[PDB]
Write a protein that binds this ligand. Structure first.
Ligand SMILES: *[C@@H]1O[C@H](CO)[C@@H](O[C@@H]2O[C@H](CO)[C@@H](O)[C@H](O)[C@H]2NC(C)=O)[C@H](O)[C@H]1NC(C)=O
Ligand SMILES: CC(=O)N[C@@H]1[C@@H](O)[C@H](O)[C@@H](CO)O[C@H]1O
Ligand SMILES: *[C@@H]1O[C@H](CO)[C@@H](O)[C@H](O)[C@H]1NC(C)=O
Lengths: 48, 48
């Protein structure tokens, strides 16, 4: 029901964030890519 | 003409940032160092 990121060797999920991820290129390149709402921890801290 | 940071074993350049570089000391102690702009993502993000 919800996507997470975990270390490969012991199941301990976390929210998918721009601190837990990095970017290259665009979605039409990766074969088997998926849609997901990636948290940017700066946006609440700019708005509030 | 421009300076990039890239992974050692496959050329894939990135504009040099505070997310890709760490800091120590000052520019006098290093040998063969050069001047270039470091992109700080936070200045556009605060000013937006
Ligand atoms: C991820 O979401 C995007 C939209 O944000 C999907 O893009 C659609 O792709 C279909 C097939 O070509 C088009 O008919 C739609 O018009 C597109 N939507 C928009 C808003 O442009 C994309 O297909 C989704 N990918 C996955 C794997 O779910
Ligand atoms: C990302 C990716 O490779 N997805 C494929 C999918 O397209 C295919 O229909 C399925 C069965 O062959 O195997 C998987
Ligand atoms: C590299 O070697 C040249 C001599 O060929 C010297 O002039 C230059 O200052 C050296 N640069 C660094 C970073 O060591």
């Amino acid at each position: 029901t919800h996507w997470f990121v975990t270390q490969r060797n012991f199941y301990e999920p976390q929210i998918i964030t721009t601190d837990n991820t990095f970017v290259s290129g665009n979605c039409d390149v990766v074969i088997g890519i998926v849609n997901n709402t990636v948290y940017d921890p700066l946006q609440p801290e700019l708005d509030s």
